[PDB]
Design a protein around this motif. Structure first.
Motif, short mmCIF file in Angstrom:
data_model
loop_
_atom_site.label_atom_id
_atom_site.label_comp_id
_atom_site.label_asym_id
_atom_site.label_seq_id
_atom_site.Cartn_x
_atom_site.Cartn_y
_atom_site.Cartn_z
N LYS A 1 58.18 58.47 50.16
CA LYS A 1 58.69 59.66 49.49
C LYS A 1 58.11 59.83 48.08
N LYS B 1 57.09 51.68 43.13
CA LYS B 1 57.41 53.10 43.22
C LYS B 1 57.11 53.87 41.95
CE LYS B 1 61.39 52.45 46.25
NZ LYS B 1 62.84 52.69 46.31
N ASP C 1 61.35 54.82 51.62
CA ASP C 1 61.59 55.18 50.23
C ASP C 1 60.33 55.06 49.38
OD1 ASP C 1 62.33 52.58 51.29
OD2 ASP C 1 63.00 51.97 49.25
#
Ligand SMILES: Cc1cc(-n2nccn2)cc(C(=O)NNS(=O)(=O)c2ccccc2)c1F
Ligand code: NA
Ligand SMILES: [Zn+2]
Length: 268
Positions: free
Chosen positions: A27, A42, A24
Motif C-alpha cells: 500500500k 515503509k 501493508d
C-alpha cells in the motif's frame, strides 16, 4: 495496490512485476531497503533511522570471491533465512517467473557486490539448488536494473559455470529465462565456445566449459557451425570463420573476468 517503486542504497528503481511483500508494505508509495541487510521498510524516517543503526556493510555468509572491488558472497538459505527471503522478494520485483520466496532452505545464494570505502554494494545474485535433480547450475539469476547490460550479468553467468567446473559437472540455467536472460546466456555461450574453437568434439567443449551439450549444440546451430551426419551433430567450422564471428561488435565490451585464482571455494 502492489509495491511499484523501491529505494535501495542511492537508487530509486521502478518495479517490473508483482512481488508478494505483505499487504501493508504494498500500500505504500515506496519501499525502502537497507542495501546491506535487505530489511524492507515503509517510511523514509524508519529507513533513515535504520541506516544510522545497521552495522552490516556487506552480505552475510562467506566471501568466496574477491578480486579488486568485485566480491561474491555465498549465503546458505538455512543459515540466513530472513536475509534470503528479503532477497527473494527483492528479486521477484524484476523476475516474472520466480515463484519461490519464503522456502529458501533448499537454496544457496551467490550475491555479487561492488565495493567502495563505505561498503559492499549489492549488484545482483543467483540462487542454486543444493540438490538439483535436473542438473541446473542456476535457479534464478537477477541483476538490478541500474547494473544491467554492464558486464555484471556475464560475470555471474561465468561464475556459475566455474562452480560447475569445480563440481566436475555440466549445468544449465533453470528455464524459462527472462528476455534479457536469454540474450545474455546466448551471448556468453557464443563467446566462450568461439574462444575455445579459436585456440575438439562437442563432448570436449562440454567438458572444458561445463556447458551442456544441448546448450552447445543450440548455440553452434545459431552460429551455423554444426553439420548433421547420421543422427549426430558434428562441429563444422573453419578457424577463419571463428575469427570473423569474434571480431563482431557483440564481443567488443571488455568483460569483468572471473579469475579462478581468486575463487576460494571447494565443492560440497
Ligand atoms: C542472466 C541475466 C539476467 C538479468 N536479469 N534478468 C532479470 C533481471 N535481470 C540481467 C543480465 C544482464 O545484466 N546482462 N547484461 S551483461 O552483463 O552486460 C552480458 C553481456 C554479455 C553476455 C552476457 C551478459 C543477465 F545476464
Ligand atoms: Na527504474
Ligand atoms: Zn540493515
Amino acid at each position: 495496490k502492489y509495491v511499484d517503486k523501491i529505494h535501495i542504497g542511492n537508487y530509486e528503481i521502478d518495479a517490473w512485476y508483482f512481488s508478494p511483500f505483505p499487504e501493508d508494505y504494498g500500500k505504500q508509495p515506496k519501499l525502502w531497503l537497507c542495501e546491506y541487510c535487505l530489511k524492507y521498510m515503509k517510511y523514509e524516517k524508519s529507513y533513515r533511522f535504520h541506516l544510522g543503526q545497521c552495522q552490516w556493510r556487506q552480505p552475510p555468509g562467506k566471501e568466496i570471491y574477491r578480486k579488486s572491488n568485485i566480491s561474491v558472497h555465498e549465503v546458505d538459505g538455512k543459515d540466513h533465512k530472513i536475509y534470503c527471503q528479503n532477497l527473494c522478494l527483492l528479486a521477484k520485483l524484476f523476475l516474472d517467473h520466480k515463484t519461490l520466496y519464503f522456502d529458501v532452505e533448499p537454496f544457496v545464494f551467490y550475491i555479487l557486490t561492488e565495493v567502495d570505502r563505505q561498503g559492499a554494494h549489492i549488484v545482483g545474485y543467483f540462487s542454486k539448488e543444493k540438490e538439483s535433480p535436473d542438473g541446473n547450475n542456476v535457479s534464478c539469476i537477477m541483476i538490478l536494473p541500474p547494473y544491467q547490460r554492464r558486464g555484471y550479468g556475464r560475470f555471474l553467468i561465468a561464475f556459475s559455470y566455474e562452480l560447475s567446473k569445480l563440481e566436475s559437472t555440466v549445468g544449465s540455467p533453470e528455464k524459462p529465462l527472462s528476455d534479457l536472460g536469454k540474450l545474455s546466456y546466448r551471448s556468453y555461450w557464443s563467446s566462450v565456445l568461439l574462444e575455445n574453437l579459436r585456440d575438439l568434439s562437442i563432448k570436449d567443449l562440454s567438458q572444458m566449459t561445463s556447458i551442456t551439450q544441448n546448450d552447445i549444440i543450440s548455440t553452434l546451430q545459431s552460429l551455423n557451425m554444426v553439420k548433421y551426419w547420421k543422427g549426430q551433430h558434428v562441429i563444422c567450422v573453419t578457424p577463419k570463420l571463428v575469427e570473423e564471428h569474434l571480431k563482431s561488435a557483440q564481443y567488443k565490451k571488455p568483460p569483468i573476468t572471473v579469475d579462478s585464482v581468486c575463487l576460494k571455494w571447494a565443492p560440497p
